Design a protein around this ligand. Structure first.
Ligand SMILES: CCCCCCCCCCCCCCCCCC(=O)OC[C@H](COP(=O)(O)OCCN)OC(=O)CCCCCCCCCCCCCCCCC
Ligand SMILES: NC(=O)C1=CN([C@@H]2O[C@H](COP(=O)(O)OP(=O)(O)OC[C@H]3O[C@@H](n4cnc5c(N)ncnc54)[C@H](OP(=O)(O)O)[C@@H]3O)[C@@H](O)[C@H]2O)C=CC1
Ligand code: SF4
Ligand code: SF4
Ligand code: SF4
Ligand code: SF4
Ligand code: SF4
Ligand SMILES: [K+]
Ligand SMILES: [Zn+2]
Lengths: 41, 156, 291, 95, 114, 360, 43, 48, 176, 340, 208
């Protein structure tokens, strides 16, 4: 069958080597960056 | 006093003996190893100054850290320096061994070899030329010349 | 454009001006695009920038030694596509590639302008607007733009207590919080109260509210005296701008009672003027005859 | 044109000198604060104002390709001389 | 939700592999204290290995614990073959680090960290 | 002493080059390549220059290409002096070391004249080269090449006919041809094993299809045939330097596309577009079209390659560095089977391993 | 223009080949010298 | 410079100094900028 | 277009076999190597006498950094931050404000000489030739922080080495 | 508080601690680990050194750039002390000599120099001074060390009324003269004692505990003017202490009683050289002096320090003295010594 | 376009387009896309189940003969759900050519090791274990090769920062070189250099 069923939450916080202090105390911010009003592009 | 002059001449003799025959160890890491071999090459020629290679750390005096100090060779460098008999000296050649260099912000570079070993003469450059490295070695000789070991021992 | 020049002549040198302590004016660099005039006429509505001259000597100036001081007079620093109009406090102090652009909120007025505080090595350099359609379209007031250097003078840094003489001196946080909480534990009822300022967020206000609810003290007050008669603050529709800031573009008649919205909330006045211009609004001001 | 603080320490041309109670004078104990003594703002005041007879003058700092890029200065202001943006020199229409 | 496994079909074989890796480290710790001539005890080393295993105790993903088994085997091979030194083993015992604040009041006292 | 397992652990000089390249612009990320192979500086500059110019869809001027080939062959002389003299130093013959480093000192004077620094020149830039040749340099390069062939002659007098040298290199590390193609060997490691392959002959770059030279091919695949291949590449490099000094064309040294190469400082202070282009090339840098190239050239160790992925912005998105010494030090594990401790040193000598590019 | 260029008649040709001068005697001459030294020493 | 003398300026040193390391004339690095945040100084009058 | 190194089939006549056996027994190539070493015994060595002699250089040499001046006393640095923008090591820190006569000048110009890779992008990015990388390479120090130059040490190096950097740029600026 | 001495950072190497320390006697044993522990907080440490600069070289890798400032000083020189302590806000005094020399007796090292440093630290405006006295220091002891150190204790207390005086009991470590003295009498002839050394009682305190006590004494404003007594958690006789020393090092052990007839005369028999002395009569009178118990003084428990006992670090100390035949041994091989 | 613009090699483009159609119509099971760059290089974008069956074709087929593995490369792209883009570069000495084979994976899906086809990759994908964390099953000695031994993490992932999470310094207390949390003396100053004007119109992405 060579395919297993994984319905658990896709989490790799124990595989990126990141310490815990920089996971549960950091606030990631997803944003479209605003246009610099000096410029028109 | 009289014995002050005696220990003064004894300091002059042993400081001359230590600065006159400094034996560097065969330690290169990166691009600066090529220029240190140019400082051994027949143009600039360390060997006229009594400066001759001993590969063993047990029988050397100055450790020219010529290259970049990564994380994987920090305890190797520390154990090499610890296996040098006192008095031992360290010349930090090149910018990576001085203060991190071109790879200062990297994830696997020890930012300067003064975090690991005590450093006497900083020779700056990328690479410093073999003339500049020879200037660092002669400035190390000027540093050893004004040591006052037995004078401070007689005055302690 | 092309990557080199064919010009071999002597260029022109256009004389500098003096239009205020905010907009440093170097008119040699101008390209005569006339965004000065269209901004100062249509949006700022001040009518003090024009073109004097004919041909290559057409100088975008004022023709008099007039000091262009509007409530939005710094925004010509934004929309000038060249360096002819620079920000005089920001002049010579920074350079834009190294600036960390951190998105933030204006607090100087009640409009709450979406801004970007652009910093450099952990120090505030300037404040730019964010293009936001409902509030501050891409403009800010001059207070918003140029009040960053009052943020670095006369700052409180360390906890200060009264000594045996009655003079404020520096101390640690343990001593300061001990001497505050020792008085706090001996209060109850209306014996302890709180005044809120003008620049304090909701987190600190609700923190101090729960702190004075541990003491059972409900006397917590603000500087601005809003009338508590009637519904007061119970229903939210008696202390808000209930329509929108964008709803000014849907109205036809705007009544203003006792207010000077040019200075109390300047971009609300800019939205009123855009509705006055493009929608043929009617405005009546019950109050003092201000410009 | 270097002056001296009341602490006993020289003053740069920027205007930096340490406080009396700032501990970072201890890096100068037993050593010296290497400051420059050729202040540029006091050496540019010794330049006389170049009396020229044109309306637009072209300044490049001298030397041709060894100075700053060549800019043009308007001189119609008679109350204020036309200061070069790079080199600090200044010109005057003599009429 | 149907992705290719690494070595374990489900959680049971993955627990078996974690269990055999813990067996290997339990056998390993006295040799690591002996030949590296450390200053730690076998009780302290085995409790630190228990702490390193219980640090990842929240994972129910079989592929993640398979990769943790594989990286533990890499740590084990770098420990049996003397490729780690004294310092690379003592990096687990964070001894030179000052004791860090835990409660709210000391983190309030020392800095701006949440 | 019969070695059963060679495991070369590397990464003792891994300084994270190709992550730091991803944050710095193309002009800023040029001098990393001088520091990868620290005896083949301008060859790595030439590889990264060909990669960026292949992405930018431009080409150098002719004089810049002839300068690149001339200093590429001077750099080939540098790398083969380093290879021969350190392979003799690792055995014990420490004398032609001191003989040939005078010539290598003179070539570093040539670098110091043409760029200013002796080793890491920052000279061969995308768009050609940075600075034109100083007056009186080609006279000194001719006076050097008139004397260097005698140095190659007396080096080959010393080590090639000597029986103590031949006892250390005749049956040491025989590399079969199909396993050389299988192990990713390139350059001399192929050409000592009889495989005819030279990236200047087969997939030619800038003007190597106009200069005429020969390709040394070994016969047994030992250390000794690769020694003879390196000596003969010094011979052929003298031949190419003669052909380049006889055929140097006049003209400029940068591409005249001034949005890629900076303008002259004489016109940077006079024109407006030249000052704007100088400003935006030395602050932002030039944009590169999006795409992924793998430009690989014949460094004297073998195939030196840059796999450069450009997202469109003025910084590289990925810059993978293929070194010859990486695959050669991989092949060390087969090459040292059946030999002793004093032959592993000779195998690490005959594969010219500079660990700066092995580790990146 | 004034630029780093090769001279008028180009450069001279540059040798790039091997030159080993083939010194020394023959094998018969060297063994004759050695065996004559043996015979004089023996006498 | 006995044949082609260098061009004179008013700011070039009249006394060339050698490398001054180890001496009391050795260079010390420091901040060449002034204080950024103006701290609040309290009025030293009594508060009644 | 290719040649076979080490594909010489040796001759098998009794003359050349006797010659190779004489080479084996009587050691001809050993005497050849000793003769070449003896020929280098009697030459003049290439050892220059540092520090009384100096290694040959060029006017393009990249050594110690310095901020130059105009021939009026004014410092050239107009605080435009191209040198810290193109700096591949980010060794330069620049903080600027208008001084007492309103001119755009620096207040902090630090070149960390141990991050600095001496590649000379700052001497070619500077539009006014303010920062230059002069001739000095004998500036080795006994302590690390003496290799962290501020604006004051760079202006003192400019005042020190201006009599040489002016002549080097005078000889070199036509190539640039 | 001044804006440059405000503590910043996460307390690491490049942080700012808010501590400007002047560590006298920093080139010895306690000053080594004190500069090591201050430099990882980012404290600007002024190191006054009298000796050769080379002997100070091992202090250079202990901090960031400019966080250790070396300067010359003399003990009889008020100018050097006032030149060194004028910018500080804590002055730690670690100046001591286990032996008197021709130029310095115990009166110079323990009475003159600490009174000079405390007097200058008062009259130059230093907020915190810290002095280090010995636990057995008393006015009427039979040793010159403890008498001069108790007199210096009383002087430093009375001339600087907030001087944090610290009493470490007996410090053992790597570069000490406590376990390195007990282990380096092995091939002299058999570890001499008086009445087999079962008459005097010690409690050795570990050097990282003493250094963390000095750090917490700098940090704590409550620790001003106290007189701390740093002791280890376990008290030992001298006899089973030397049992444990020669049982960790795996050495032969045949002690013998050498009475007061001739064991004070082996000083003038065994420091006939003018060099660094192996033993002396003061070392004899201090090793055979019991550690007095002072429960009223605050100790390592009253500064938030867990006192680490002998057995967890004695192998770390005394691995240096094993020949080869039990270098591959363990800590789980030697049974721990009997406490009292 | 004569002095500066690169000469276009239409011969290489036509021959690589023909060989790309060849490799496409032989292997429709794994070959997803076939593209030829504007500077005449070929890219065969495949599925990760065809690591071995594609390369063994190109190593052996009489009109491919790509006997040499020049360089194996992984490229991390965070915005894709299969974030790692493993790149095989093949050199054929007889057909004088190069091909590029591009496969993909996320952190958890293993890619099959190609040491059975080319032994040269014995370190390369091993490096891709060390630098990225892509697991390569059926590899003999799969372990870290460039990082330090006590290195936790994977460096060339783009969520890993430039400076690490640990620094090494010697410490005289425990007489040992120890790892502590990093505190940079100067911050790495990030420069926002991306100019907001469209530099290349032919590479425009069409909108949503
Ligand atoms: C009661 C009275 C006696 C008291 C005790 C005396 C003990 C022995 C004293 C020996 C001499 C001590 C003084 C040493 C030199 C001091 C002056 C000095 O600095 O001279 C430097 C000078 C070379 O200068 P330098 O800077 O090195 O040169 C660079 C190139 N321009 O140096 C020179 O020109 C050469 C220096 C030579 C030193 C003397 C020769 C060696 C010592 C011989 C005696 C001891 C040997 C014992 C047995 C050893 C094996 C034979
Ligand atoms: N037995 C113990 O270990 C205990 C010791 N103490 C006290 O703690 C302090 C530190 O002890 P410790 O580290 O072991 O001693 P050390 O012998 O190891 O170091 C003492 C330091 O003081 C300096 N010094 C001493 N006298 C002079 C002088 N006259 N002039 C200049 N420098 C001088 C020495 O420097 P230099 O090399 O230049 O002479 C040396 O660096 C001492 O005061 C000691 O009495 C307290 C409790 C227990
Ligand atoms: S300081 Fe620079 S040139 Fe020198 S060894 Fe380091 S990387 Fe190479
Ligand atoms: S906005 Fe700027 S460019 Fe346009 S008219 Fe005004 S000064 Fe000139
Ligand atoms: S930056 Fe723009 S406005 Fe300023 S001088 Fe250059 S082109 Fe003109
Ligand atoms: S030489 Fe290069 S690394 Fe050094 S300051 Fe100049 S640009 Fe930066
Ligand atoms: S040194 Fe030159 S490039 Fe750098 S800020 Fe000053 S003037 Fe500009
Ligand atoms: K503007
Ligand atoms: Zn000018």
């Amino acid at each position: 069958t060579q395919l297993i069923t994984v319905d658990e939450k896709l989490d790799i916080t124990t595989l990126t080597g990141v310490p815990e202090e920089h996971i549960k105390t950091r606030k990631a911010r997803i944003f479209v960056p605003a246009r610099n009003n000096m410029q028109s592009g | 006093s009289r014995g002050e002059y005696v220990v003064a001449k004894l300091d002059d003799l042993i400081n001359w003996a230590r600065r006159s025959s400094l034996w560097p160890m065969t330690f290169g890491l990166a691009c600066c190893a090529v220029e240190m071999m140019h400082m051994a090459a027949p143009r600039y020629d360390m060997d006229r100054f009594g400066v001759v290679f001993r590969a063993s750390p047990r029988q050397s005096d100055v450790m020219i850290v010529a290259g970049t100090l990564t994380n994987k060779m920090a305890p190797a460098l520390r154990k090499v320096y610890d296996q040098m008999p006192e008095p031992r000296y360290v010349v930090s050649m090149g910018s990576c061994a001085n203060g991190g260099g071109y790879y200062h912000y990297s994830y696997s570079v020890v930012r300067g070899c003064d975090r690991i070993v005590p450093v006497d003469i900083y020779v700056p450059g990328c690479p410093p030329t073999a003339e500049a490295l020879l200037y660092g070695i002669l400035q190390l000789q000027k540093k050893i010349k004004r040591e006052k070991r037995l004078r401070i021992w007689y005055r302690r | 454009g092309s990557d080199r020049s064919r010009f071999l002549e002597g260029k022109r040198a256009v004389e500098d001006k003096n239009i205020g302590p905010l907009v440093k004016t170097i008119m040699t660099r101008c390209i005569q695009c006339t965004r000065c005039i269209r901004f100062a006429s249509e949006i700022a509505g001040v009518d003090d920038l024009g073109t004097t001259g004919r041909g290559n000597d057409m100088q975008v100036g004022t023709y008099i030694e007039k000091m262009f001081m509007s409530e939005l007079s710094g925004n010509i620093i934004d929309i000038c596509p060249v360096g002819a109009l620079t920000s005089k406090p920001y002049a010579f102090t920074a350079r834009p590639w190294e600036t960390r652009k951190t998105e933030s909120i204006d607090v100087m007025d009640a409009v709450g302008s979406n801004i970007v505080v652009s910093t450099r090595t952990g120090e505030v350099m300037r404040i730019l607007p964010r293009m936001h359609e409902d509030i501050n379209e891409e403009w800010i007031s001059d207070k918003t733009r140029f009040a960053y250097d009052g943020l670095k003078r006369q700052r409180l840094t360390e906890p200060m207590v009264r000594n045996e003489k009655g003079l404020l001196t520096h101390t640690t946080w343990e001593d300061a919080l001990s001497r505050v909480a020792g008085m706090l534990q001996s209060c109850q009822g209306n014996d302890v109260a709180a005044i809120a300022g003008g620049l304090v967020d909701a987190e600190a206000l609700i923190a101090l509210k729960d702190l004075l609810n541990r003491v059972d003290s409900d006397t917590l007050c603000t500087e601005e005296v809003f009338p508590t008669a009637g519904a007061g603050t119970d229903l939210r529709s008696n202390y808000l701008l209930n329509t929108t800031i964008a709803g000014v573009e849907e109205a036809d008649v705007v009544l203003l009672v006792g207010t000077n919205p040019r200075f109390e909330a300047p971009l609300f006045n800019a939205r009123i003027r855009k509705s006055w211009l493009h929608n043929d609004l009617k405005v009546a001001l019950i109050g003092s005859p201000v410009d | 044109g270097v002056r001296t603080s009341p602490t006993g320490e020289k003053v740069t041309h920027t205007g930096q000198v340490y406080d009396d109670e700032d501990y970072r004078r201890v890096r100068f104990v037993g050593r010296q604060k290497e400051v420059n003594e050729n202040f540029a703002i006091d050496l540019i005041a010794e330049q006389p104002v170049s009396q020229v007879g044109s309306r637009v003058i072209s300044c490049d700092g001298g030397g041709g390709a060894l100075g700053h890029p060549r800019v043009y200065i308007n001189l119609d202001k008679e109350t204020k001389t036309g200061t070069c943006g790079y080199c600090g020199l200044q010109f005057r229409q003599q009429h | 939700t149907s992705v290719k496994p690494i070595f374990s079909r489900d959680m049971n074989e993955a627990k078996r592999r974690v269990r055999e890796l813990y067996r290997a480290w339990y056998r390993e710790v006295p040799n690591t204290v002996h030949l590296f001539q450390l200053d730690i005890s076998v009780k302290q080393g085995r409790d630190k290995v228990r702490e390193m295993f219980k640090k990842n105790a929240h994972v129910t993903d079989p592929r993640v614990v398979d990769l943790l088994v594989i990286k533990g085997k890499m740590e084990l091979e770098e420990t049996i073959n003397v490729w780690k030194q004294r310092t690379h083993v003592m990096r687990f015992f964070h001894e030179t680090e000052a004791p860090r604040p835990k409660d709210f009041l000391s983190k309030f006292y020392v800095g701006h960290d949440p | 002493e019969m070695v059963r397992k060679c495991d070369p652990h590397i990464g003792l000089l891994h300084r994270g080059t190709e992550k730091l390249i991803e944050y710095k612009t193309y002009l800023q990320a040029l001098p990393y390549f001088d520091r990868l192979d620290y005896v083949s500086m301008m060859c790595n500059e030439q590889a990264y220059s060909l990669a960026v110019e292949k992405l930018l869809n431009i080409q150098p001027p002719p004089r810049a290409q002839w300068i690149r080939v001339l200093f590429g062959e001077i750099t080939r002389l540098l790398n083969h002096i380093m290879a021969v003299t350190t392979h003799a130093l690792d055995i014990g013959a420490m004398t032609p070391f001191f003989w040939m480093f005078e010539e290598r000192e003179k070539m570093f004077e040539f670098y110091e004249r043409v760029s200013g620094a002796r080793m890491h020149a920052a000279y061969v830039r995308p768009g050609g080269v940075h600075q034109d040749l100083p007056l009186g340099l080609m006279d000194d390069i001719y006076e050097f090449s008139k004397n260097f062939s005698l140095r190659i002659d007396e080096l080959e007098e010393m080590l090639t006919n000597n029986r103590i040298w031949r006892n250390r290199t005749v049956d040491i590390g025989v590399v079969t041809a199909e396993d050389a193609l299988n192990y990713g060997f390139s350059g001399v490691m192929l050409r000592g094993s009889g495989i005819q392959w030279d990236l200047r002959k087969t997939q030619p770059y800038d003007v190597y299809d106009q200069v005429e030279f020969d390709v040394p091919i070994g016969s047994r695949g030992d250390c000794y045939d690769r020694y003879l291949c390196r000596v003969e590449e010094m011979r052929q490099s003298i031949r190419i330097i003669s052909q380049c000094l006889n055929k140097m064309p006049p003209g400029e040294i940068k591409v005249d596309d001034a949005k890629v190469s900076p303008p002259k400082r004489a016109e940077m202070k006079t024109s407006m577009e030249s000052l704007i282009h100088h400003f935006k090339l030395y602050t932002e840098g030039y944009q590169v079209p999006p795409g992924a190239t793998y430009t690989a050239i014949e460094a004297p160790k073998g195939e030196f390659g840059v796999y450069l992925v450009s997202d469109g912005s003025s910084r590289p998105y990925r810059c993978k560095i293929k070194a010859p010494g990486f695959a050669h030090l991989a092949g060390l594990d087969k090459m040292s089977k059946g030999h002793m401790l004093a032959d592993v040193v000779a195998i690490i000598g005959t594969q010219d391993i500079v660990f700066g590019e092995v580790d990146r | 223009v004034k630029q780093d260029m090769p001279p008028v008649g180009g450069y001279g040709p540059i040798d790039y080949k091997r030159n080993l001068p083939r010194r020394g005697l023959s094998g018969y001459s060297m063994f004759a010298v050695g065996i004559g030294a043996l015979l004089f020493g023996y006498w | 410079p006995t044949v082609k003398p260098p061009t004179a300026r008013k700011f070039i040193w009249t006394n060339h100094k050698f490398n001054l390391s180890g001496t009391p004339q050795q260079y010390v690095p420091y901040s060449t900028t002034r204080k950024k945040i103006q701290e609040w100084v309290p009025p030293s009058t009594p508060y009644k | 277009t290719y040649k076979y190194v080490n594909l010489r089939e040796p001759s098998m006549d009794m003359k050349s076999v006797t010659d190779r056996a004489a080479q084996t027994l009587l050691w001809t190539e050993l005497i050849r190597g000793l003769g070449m070493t003896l020929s280098y015994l009697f030459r003049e060595p290439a050892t220059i006498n540092y520090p009384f002699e100096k290694g040959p250089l060029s006017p393009r040499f990249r050594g110690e950094h310095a901020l130059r001046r105009y021939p009026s006393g004014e410092e050239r640095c107009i605080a435009c931050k191209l040198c810290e923008a193109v700096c591949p090591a980010q060794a330069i820190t620049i903080e600027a404000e208008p001084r007492a006569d309103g001119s755009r000048r620096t207040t902090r110009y630090d070149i960390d000489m141990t991050k600095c890779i001496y590649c000379g992008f700052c001497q070619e990015a500077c539009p006014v030739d303010a920062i230059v990388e002069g001739p000095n390479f004998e500036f080795s120090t006994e302590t690390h922080e003496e290799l962290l130059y501020n604006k004051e040490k760079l202006l003192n190096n400019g005042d020190k080495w201006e009599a040489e950097i002016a002549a080097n740029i005078q000889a070199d600026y036509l190539y640039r | 508080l001044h804006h440059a001495v405000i503590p910043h950072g996460k307390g690491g190497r490049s942080s700012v601690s808010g501590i400007v320390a002047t560590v006298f006697g920093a080139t010895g044993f306690l000053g080594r680990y004190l500069v090591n522990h201050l430099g990882r907080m980012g404290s600007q440490v002024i190191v006054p050194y009298r000796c050769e600069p080379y002997d100070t070289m091992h202090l250079r890798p202990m901090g960031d750039l400019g966080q250790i400032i070396f300067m010359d000083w003399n003990g009889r020189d008020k100018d050097s002390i006032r030149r060194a302590v004028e910018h500080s806000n804590v002055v730690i005094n670690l100046v001591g000599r286990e032996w008197e020399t021709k130029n310095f007796d115990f009166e110079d090292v323990f009475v003159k120099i600490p009174q000079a440093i405390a007097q200058v630290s008062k009259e130059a405006g230093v907020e915190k001074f810290i002095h280090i006295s010995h636990l057995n220091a008393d006015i009427k002891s039979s040793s010159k060390y403890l008498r001069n150190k108790a007199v210096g204790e009383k002087e430093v207390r009375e001339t600087f009324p907030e001087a944090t005086i610290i009493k470490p009991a007996d410090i053992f470590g790597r570069e000490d003269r406590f376990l390195n003295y007990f282990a380096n009498i092995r091939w002299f002839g058999g570890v001499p004692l008086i009445s087999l050394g079962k008459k005097t009682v010690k409690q050795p305190v570990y050097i990282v505990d003493v250094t963390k006590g000095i750090i917490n004494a700098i940090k704590d404003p409550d620790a001003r003017g106290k007189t701390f007594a740093f002791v280890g958690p376990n008290r030992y006789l001298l006899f089973d202490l030397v049992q444990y020393v020669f049982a960790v090092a795996h050495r032969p052990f045949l002690p013998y009683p050498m009475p007061h007839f001739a064991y004070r005369w082996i000083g003038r028999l065994f420091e006939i050289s003018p060099f660094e002395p192996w033993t002396t009569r003061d070392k004899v009178e201090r090793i055979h002096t019991t550690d007095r118990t002072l429960p009223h003084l605050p100790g390592l428990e009253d500064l938030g320090v867990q006192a680490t006992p002998l057995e967890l670090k004695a192998i770390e100390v005394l691995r240096r003295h094993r020949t080869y035949r039990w270098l591959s041994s363990e800590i789980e091989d030697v049974q721990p010594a009997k406490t009292v | 376009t004569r002095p500066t613009v690169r000469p276009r090699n239409d011969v290489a483009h036509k021959q690589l387009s023909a060989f790309g159609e060849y490799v496409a119509e032989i292997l429709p099971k794994y070959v997803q896309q076939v593209q030829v760059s504007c500077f005449s290089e070929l890219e065969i974008c495949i599925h990760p189940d065809g690591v071995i069956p594609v390369l063994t074709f190109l190593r052996d087929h009489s009109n491919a003969q790509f006997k040499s593995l020049a360089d194996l490369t992984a490229v991390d792209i965070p915005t894709r759900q299969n974030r790692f883009e493993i790149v095989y570069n093949l050199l054929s000495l007889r057909f004088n050519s190069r091909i590029r084979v591009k496969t993909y994976t996320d952190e958890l899906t293993p890619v099959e090791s190609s040491v059975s086809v080319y032994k040269a990759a014995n370190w390369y994908e091993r490096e891709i274990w060390d630098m990225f964390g892509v697991f390569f099953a059926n590899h003999p000695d799969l372990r870290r090769i460039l990082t330090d031994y006590g290195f936790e993490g994977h460096p060339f992932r783009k969520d890993f920062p430039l400076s690490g999470y640990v620094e090494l310094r010697y410490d005289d207390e425990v007489k040992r070189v120890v790892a502590e949390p990093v505190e940079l003396a100067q911050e790495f100053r990030k420069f926002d250099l991306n100019s907001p004007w469209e530099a290349f119109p032919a590479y425009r992405q069409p909108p949503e």
